[PDB]
Scaffold this active site. Structure first.
Site, PDB file in Angstrom:
ATOM      1  N   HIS A 111      12.209  -2.634  -4.025  1.00 42.42           N
ATOM      2  CA  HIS A 111      12.091  -3.501  -2.864  1.00 42.42           C
ATOM      3  C   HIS A 111      10.659  -4.003  -2.747  1.00 42.42           C
ATOM      4  CE1 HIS A 111      10.831   0.038  -0.298  1.00 42.42           C
ATOM      5  NE2 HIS A 111      10.161  -0.905   0.345  1.00 42.42           N
ATOM      6  N   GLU A 153      -8.604   3.304  -5.578  1.00 44.30           N
ATOM      7  CA  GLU A 153      -8.920   2.890  -4.213  1.00 44.30           C
ATOM      8  C   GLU A 153      -8.995   4.048  -3.256  1.00 44.30           C
ATOM      9  OE1 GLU A 153      -9.910   0.208  -3.096  1.00 44.30           O
ATOM     10  OE2 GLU A 153      -8.845  -1.575  -3.833  1.00 44.30           O
ATOM     11  N   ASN A 180     -10.919   3.111   0.536  1.00 43.73           N
ATOM     12  CA  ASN A 180     -10.850   2.027   1.488  1.00 43.73           C
ATOM     13  C   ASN A 180     -10.406   0.743   0.793  1.00 43.73           C
ATOM     14  OD1 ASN A 180     -11.519  -0.074   3.320  1.00 43.73           O
ATOM     15  ND2 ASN A 180     -12.873   1.318   4.392  1.00 43.73           N
ATOM     16  N   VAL A 190     -12.979  -2.340   1.269  1.00 43.20           N
ATOM     17  CA  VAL A 190     -14.373  -2.191   0.834  1.00 43.20           C
ATOM     18  C   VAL A 190     -14.450  -1.806  -0.632  1.00 43.20           C
ATOM     19  CG1 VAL A 190     -16.558  -0.947   1.215  1.00 43.20           C
ATOM     20  CG2 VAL A 190     -15.015  -1.404   3.156  1.00 43.20           C
ATOM     21  N   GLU A 248     -13.013   1.446  -8.245  1.00 41.42           N
ATOM     22  CA  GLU A 248     -11.834   0.596  -8.419  1.00 41.42           C
ATOM     23  C   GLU A 248     -11.664   0.027  -9.810  1.00 41.42           C
ATOM     24  OE1 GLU A 248     -14.304   0.024  -6.111  1.00 41.42           O
ATOM     25  OE2 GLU A 248     -13.302   0.030  -4.130  1.00 41.42           O
ATOM     26  N   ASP A 283       5.860  11.126   9.183  1.00 38.96           N
ATOM     27  CA  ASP A 283       6.712  10.349   8.290  1.00 38.96           C
ATOM     28  C   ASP A 283       5.909   9.309   7.525  1.00 38.96           C
ATOM     29  OD1 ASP A 283       9.849   8.597   9.229  1.00 38.96           O
ATOM     30  OD2 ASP A 283       9.199   9.427   7.267  1.00 38.96           O
ATOM     31  N   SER A 284       6.554   8.701   6.536  1.00 37.69           N
ATOM     32  CA  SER A 284       6.036   7.490   5.934  1.00 37.69           C
ATOM     33  C   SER A 284       6.483   6.282   6.796  1.00 37.69           C
ATOM     34  CB  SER A 284       6.511   7.367   4.508  1.00 37.69           C
ATOM     35  OG  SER A 284       7.901   7.379   4.364  1.00 37.69           O
ATOM     36  N   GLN A 334       5.935   1.586   7.317  1.00 38.36           N
ATOM     37  CA  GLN A 334       5.731   0.281   6.719  1.00 38.36           C
ATOM     38  C   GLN A 334       4.381   0.196   5.979  1.00 38.36           C
ATOM     39  OE1 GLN A 334       6.068  -3.132   9.411  1.00 38.36           O
ATOM     40  NE2 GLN A 334       6.181  -4.543   7.650  1.00 38.36           N
ATOM     41  N   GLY A 335       4.419  -0.258   4.726  1.00 37.81           N
ATOM     42  CA  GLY A 335       3.179  -0.314   3.982  1.00 37.81           C
ATOM     43  C   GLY A 335       3.017   0.849   3.034  1.00 37.81           C
ATOM     44  N   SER A 369       5.692   1.975   1.385  1.00 38.06           N
ATOM     45  CA  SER A 369       6.776   1.635   0.463  1.00 38.06           C
ATOM     46  C   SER A 369       6.290   1.632  -0.967  1.00 38.06           C
ATOM     47  CB  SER A 369       7.261   0.207   0.752  1.00 38.06           C
ATOM     48  OG  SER A 369       8.115   0.086   1.839  1.00 38.06           O
ATOM     49  N   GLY A 370       7.032   2.259  -1.865  1.00 38.63           N
ATOM     50  CA  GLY A 370       6.703   2.240  -3.267  1.00 38.63           C
ATOM     51  C   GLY A 370       5.784   3.348  -3.718  1.00 38.63           C
TER      52      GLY A 370
HETATM   53  N1  LIG Z   1       9.940   6.241   6.496  1.00 38.41           N
HETATM   54  C1  LIG Z   1      10.460   5.102   5.677  1.00 38.41           C
HETATM   55  C2  LIG Z   1       9.371   4.301   5.017  1.00 38.41           C
HETATM   56  C3  LIG Z   1       9.166   2.922   5.632  1.00 38.41           C
HETATM   57  C4  LIG Z   1       9.480   1.870   4.571  1.00 38.41           C
HETATM   58  C5  LIG Z   1       9.591   0.549   4.977  1.00 38.41           C
HETATM   59  C6  LIG Z   1       9.715  -0.488   4.061  1.00 38.41           C
HETATM   60  C7  LIG Z   1       9.819  -1.785   4.509  1.00 38.41           C
HETATM   61  C8  LIG Z   1       9.804  -2.099   5.854  1.00 38.41           C
HETATM   62  C9  LIG Z   1       9.677  -1.082   6.781  1.00 38.41           C
HETATM   63  C10 LIG Z   1       9.578   0.217   6.331  1.00 38.41           C
HETATM   64 CA   LIG Z   2     -11.943  -0.135  -2.236  1.00 36.83          CA
END
Ligand SMILES: NCCCCc1ccccc1
Ligand SMILES: [Ca+2]
Length: 223
Positions: free
Chosen positions: A40, A52, A54, A57, A62, A171-172, A174-175, A177-178
């Site tokens: 996704h 990485e 920061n 910066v 890097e 939890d994990s 948004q951002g 992901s992957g």
């Molecule tokens: N704890 C689940 C992780 C969040 C993953 C995600 C991907 C895309 C959009 C929102 C959230």
């Molecule tokens: Ca950096």
């Protein structure tokens, strides 16, 4: 990452940031020219950013290297996120060192109750939005398959597992992901999906990497 801690610079040396003018997903370095991420996270024009801490910066460790090829899993289903895994080949080999290192693939699957390390530059709030500049970390256990399927009826496949805390708070998000889920020194999961972040009874869902090791190894060897 909600409810986690600042990892510290270069403490997660296999963590990569995928950049398309901005950080948009994590990934994991599995040798010098290959990264594992979520299907996704697929897009054209990816630069892989290694070493990485920061992401806003330039700190000195890097390596920025364009992707030459992306390979989404043959059976990826974007509707259900089944088979949410993608390989990215680097245009040039990363220079491996202390701050930039690969993570081992599993030799077998992990068990419920095993503690893992999840990391990323995703949102740190469930109460709104706040994106960190430095890498965040979270220790969390793999949950039982039945608690995972109870949390998400009709939506968990054999290629998924849940990890975290049914109480919420950690939890994990948004951002993230992957990015990686590392347990006992092996990449066992990829941050894949969930219902919000850090909410009660809604733990994160992760791609179950052990099911894909033969595909990963064959794909790399042929590409
Ligand atoms: N704890 C689940 C992780 C969040 C993953 C995600 C991907 C895309 C959009 C929102 C959230
Ligand atoms: Ca950096």
């Amino acid at each position: 990452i909600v409810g986690g801690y600042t990892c510290g610079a270069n403490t997660v040396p296999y963590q990569v940031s995928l950049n398309s003018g901005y950080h948009f997903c994590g990934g994991s370095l599995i040798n010098s020219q290959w990264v594992v991420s979520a299907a996704h996270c697929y897009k054209s024009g990816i630069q892989v950013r290694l070493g990485e801490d920061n992401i806003n910066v330039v700190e000195g460790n890097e390596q920025f290297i364009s992707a030459s090829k992306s390979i989404v899993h043959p059976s990826y289903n974007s509707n259900t996120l089944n088979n949410d895994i993608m390989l990215i080949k680097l245009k040039s080999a990363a220079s491996l060192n202390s701050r930039v290192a690969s993570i081992s693939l599993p030799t077998s699957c992990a068990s419920a109750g095993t503690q893992c390390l999840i990391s990323g530059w995703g949102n740190t709030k469930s109460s709104g939005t706040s994106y960190p500049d430095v890498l965040k970390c979270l220790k969390a256990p793999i949950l039982s398959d039945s608690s995972c399927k109870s949390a998400y009826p009709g939506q968990i496949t054999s290629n998924m597992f849940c990890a975290g805390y049914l109480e919420g708070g950690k939890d994990s998000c948004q951002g993230d992901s992957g990015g990686p889920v590392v347990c006992s020194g092996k990449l066992q999961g990829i941050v894949s999906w969930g219902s919000g972040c850090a909410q009660k009874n809604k733990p994160g869902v992760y791609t179950k990497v052990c099911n894909y090791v033969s595909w990963i190894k064959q794909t790399i060897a042929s590409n």
